[PDB]
Symmetry: D2
Subunit: 124 residues, 4 copies
Amino acid sequence: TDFFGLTIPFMQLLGVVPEHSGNGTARTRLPARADLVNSRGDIHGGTLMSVLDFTLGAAIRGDTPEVGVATIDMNTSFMSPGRGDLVIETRCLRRGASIAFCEGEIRDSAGELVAKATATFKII
Amino acid sequence: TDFFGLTIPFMQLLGVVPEHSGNGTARTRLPARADLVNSRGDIHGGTLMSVLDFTLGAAIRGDTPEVGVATIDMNTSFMSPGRGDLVIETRCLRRGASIAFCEGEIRDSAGELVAKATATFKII
Amino acid sequence: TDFFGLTIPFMQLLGVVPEHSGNGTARTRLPARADLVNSRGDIHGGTLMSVLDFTLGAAIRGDTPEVGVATIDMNTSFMSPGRGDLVIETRCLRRGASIAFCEGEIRDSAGELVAKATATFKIIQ
Amino acid sequence: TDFFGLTIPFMQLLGVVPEHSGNGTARTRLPARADLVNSRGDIHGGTLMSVLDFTLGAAIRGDTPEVGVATIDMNTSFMSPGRGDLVIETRCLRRGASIAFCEGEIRDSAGELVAKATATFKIIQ
């Protein structure tokens, strides 16, 4: 599978679908699967942090795909339980020669806020 | 599979192995699999945040398994790339009636620091 | 001194001015001072988090000065050195019966992002 | 004023005292003051992050006052209201050529955890 110009075994396991990236943003979609679920039947937070990580970075190497990106730190807030196909949109807040700052949110089909995250990246 | 007294489809997909929990701590082990890998062949950060989330919470409901736990927010720092079987140890820093604070680290077979995380939980 | 319905001896000390609070958002302002600077001459990041802490909570208790809000945890990103007067604006992302989520940013006179922060809150009621 | 090799006008303003820096750890102390309190009478969390910011960096540039460290991002957890004199102690978790990771905690005279924080740093060299 092609994830924004890169192969990623774990993202292929999660079945996430890359939709867009460019102009400092990126959009990913997470289809529902009983595999990715919580102990309460909700989409596991780990699952959300995974696709969010992917998407967060893609908002950097979408304006510049020749660039290498590595997550330094990432903060996630879980607002409400995720269920059914989700959509992840991220946005790059500031980009430098070495460091880039990003953010994003996960929303359900009903447009409600499932989770929000912000991260720091090392631009290789 | 039994994960500290709970079924979790996503943790079963990741193949993580619960080893211990109690007295405010918990220990999990993540076996190596090519499925859980990075674009650089390293264990994906999302994968680390997943097992860390599991383990972080388990350090609360190990002293009290009758308790329900839900992650509010979680911060993760990635120190060095993870490879080969990893071990995750977490520790509860403060527990209240409503809120609990946790922390943990992931280390490789060589005992080096792969990642570190801290989280906030709602004790149900 | 009046900080959206309460006196905060530390805030009064930072020389910060409350600009708005209500409908899930808030505004505050940090007039430049030399008491408040780093060693690089820039406004100290702690000065930033202090005013950001103050203002993030305000976006919750403006819709209700009847409630109490205590910061649980806060994450702050440092994008650009802060200088001169700064304006701080926050928004509540979600409000529960017990837990509140907020975010915000600090900008300089030139409108450039100085720092951005997110916070979790305990609403005391 | 001497803060491990530099003057910080804001820190000097908080009335904080440098207690140690070297070998990947650091210590600082926050003598109680009324200028530094919340509205609940507790020491303002911003006062905490300010001193925590100061001290986290110190755990890096004590092994080398030759280098510069700039805070990239910081996460702070609030566990217990802070009161009376507080002691701040940090440790460097990892040091790269460009990026440094640190953590730390604030405790009261009774030794109870007031707040814990983690931070990422840019080492300027």
